[PDB]
Design a protein around this ligand. Structure first.
Ligand SMILES: Cc1cc2nc3c(=O)[nH]c(=O)nc-3n(C[C@H](O)[C@H](O)[C@H](O)COP(=O)(O)O)c2cc1C
Ligand SMILES: Cc1cc2nc3c(=O)[nH]c(=O)nc-3n(C[C@H](O)[C@H](O)[C@H](O)COP(=O)(O)O)c2cc1C
Ligand SMILES: O=c1cc[nH]c(=O)[nH]1
Ligand SMILES: O=c1cc[nH]c(=O)[nH]1
Lengths: 341, 341
């Protein structure tokens, strides 16, 4: 019952991170920026770094997510300039054959010395795929986890034995070979929120990402983590929840709130239209923690007490300064991080 | 007419490099080995590093190319730990959608600061693709450069304008978007030996790889480079030849020959069966230069005089020692490298 929680950083592979506002920091996703971010996160003992994959943006004044790097190649570069932090890339399974993902994962396993894992996603936004002629049709919405189930069986064969003879509705392996196999058991993580998605995660994932909920209501996601725990019961597997939040912290509650309101007041409404104390569309209605460093520490400790919650995935309004103030001012106050040096 | 030639290293992304022999150095392709190789090549002013993609091996006593990393992720890692050498990854175009390759190339452009390019290949070995159910059928042999022509049109649209509406027999783009665009014009290279392959390279490539020929007959490839020059005439484009050789050099001709014979005497005949002063199957009948450091320097200077030859792509019997003796003993004697510091 002693508080212990893992901390990850959701790295800005897309421009402007997760704020859709002309008052938010404006920046392009460069390798050097993400290198600075992940090296600083590693310095402050963040447990992992994850990048999403986003194949189409939302336009507007800030050209929001119009500029995005590719996840496996970004994480391969970050693996080469880190030494301790876990590194996860996202595979949009419609865009990469499973044997290619299998070999890419083995490659970054080699780059990182065993620190690499894969976030498997089905894809949900039809424009990302229709734009390049690979959308399977609106049958995909209901069948996508059948597809993902075949996909991961191929991956598990290849990582586990170096070969696959899997034959299904979507893939045909005829003694497919991928070697080297990963030096350590390959980590698979998933971000399913639906019943079907959580059932997939319960069978195949090491843990499951879910959305934090509300502004300064850190435990509001609890029913989602409860559903994941029950999905995991149905496989007997230990598959905890990692919860996505944005942290907007400052010296005082008032100063942090002033920033949050300043961001909301610059909302890039044209971009928000394309994408279409309450949450705000300015950060895609993300669960948000806004307060003094001590207030954010207290609220993150609350997250750690939720049944099934094993970690948080953090975005910030400003990653370079936000990681620094998290490491210097927030994390030392967190009971659930007392295990760190 | 003053000798000037570029030098590249063909990095061992597959186990044991390019020797199929129990008397050859035995090693796995690791990131750390390829990092040591490319950093040493960069130190000696090699112009570029290229990795192939090989999705299935040939077995035998040495499990030859049974163990292979993936090219884009390997080169992304190498880009992060280099600063001057050009970095090329190979895309087997049947395995990756063009918009994904486009974004991966933009990503390694960002990692490398503008040092990245793509070697586009159609694929030729049916088992590499049939094993994962993606071989298009034996029509592909005659249509593969039609396919590659559509593929590169999509790439050129995306790198050039950030978007594509290309519609063809093999791809359908509906306002496909990839941004960021590369910071510098994206380099495309090809390795076509056939009439159709050279015609593709003449239209779309910056240069074309061809095979060196014979043992210690450095200019024997000349008719191939002559055919490439004539293909380039038909587009008005400047598309030179880069010639693949293995270098087996030592203090004396006799010592280098003794190594070459020692390698041939350990030929892994079971692996050679699967793959199926003369060239030898022990290095896939590669053009090979065997001699003292001074003899190899003289022969490489001969290569530089061949019409159309602009560079060489080098393998070695031992990459770590071979790059060192190339930099310390061979390159200082090469008239075509007198431009280096
Ligand atoms: C932290 C997190 C990261 C995600 N990253 C991606 C991504 O990179 N690409 C993607 O297509 N979907 C991504 N998703 C969406 C999920 O894969 C999933 O489709 C979504 O949570 C809806 O759940 P469902 O698939 O069970 O309906 C992400 C979700 C979460 C919570
Ligand atoms: C230096 C070099 C590297 C090559 N690398 C690859 C590779 O990584 N993957 C591949 O499928 N083919 C590779 N090839 C084969 C060529 O793409 C091409 O198919 C072959 O040279 C035959 O020429 P053609 O396609 O015009 O018939 C390579 C060839 C050369 C000369
Ligand atoms: O799907 C996604 C990806 C990144 N961030 C989100 O909030 N949702
Ligand atoms: O096709 C190939 C690839 C690497 N080396 C070769 O000799 N041929």
């Amino acid at each position: 019952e002693r508080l212990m929680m893992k901390i990850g950083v959701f790295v800005p592979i897309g421009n402007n991170g997760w704020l859709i506002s002309t008052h938010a920091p404006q920046y392009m996703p460069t390798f050097e920026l993400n290198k600075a971010i992940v090296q600083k996160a590693e310095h402050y003992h963040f447990d992992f770094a994850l990048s999403m994959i986003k194949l189409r943006g939302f336009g507007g004044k800030t050209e929001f997510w119009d500029h995005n790097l590719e996840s496996f190649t970004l994480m391969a570069g970050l693996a080469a300039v880190t030494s301790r932090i876990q590194i996860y890339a996202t595979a949009a399974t419609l865009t990469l054959p499973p044997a290619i993902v299998a070999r890419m994962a083995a490659t970054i396993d080699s780059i990182s010395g065993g620190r690499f894992g894969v976030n498997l996603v089905t894809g949900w936004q039809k424009p990302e795929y229709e734009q390049m002629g690979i959308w399977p049709g609106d049958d995909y919405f209901s069948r996508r986890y059948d597809y993902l189930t075949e996909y991961v069986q191929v991956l598990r064969d290849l990582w586990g034995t170096g070969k696959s003879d899997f034959k299904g509705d979507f893939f045909t392996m005829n003694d497919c070979r991928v070697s080297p196999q990963p030096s350590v058991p390959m980590k698979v993580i998933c971000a399913g929120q639906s019943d079907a998605g959580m059932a997939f995660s319960a069978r195949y994932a090491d843990f499951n990402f879910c959305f934090g909920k509300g502004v300064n209501t850190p435990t509001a996601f609890a029913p989602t983590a409860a559903r994941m725990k029950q999905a995991a019961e149905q496989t007997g597997r230990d598959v905890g929840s990692y919860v996505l939040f944005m942290v907007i912290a400052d010296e005082t509650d008032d100063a942090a709130r002033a920033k949050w309101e300043h961001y909301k007041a610059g909302a890039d409404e044209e971009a928000l239209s394309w994408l279409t104390d309450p949450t705000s569309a300015v950060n895609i209605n993300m669960g948000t923690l806004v307060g003094s460093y001590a207030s954010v520490a207290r609220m993150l400790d609350e997250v750690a007490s939720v049944p099934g919650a094993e970690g948080v995935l953090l975005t910030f309004d400003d990653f370079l300064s936000g990681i620094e103030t998290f490491g210097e001012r927030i994390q030392p106050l967190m009971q659930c991080r007392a295990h760190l040096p």
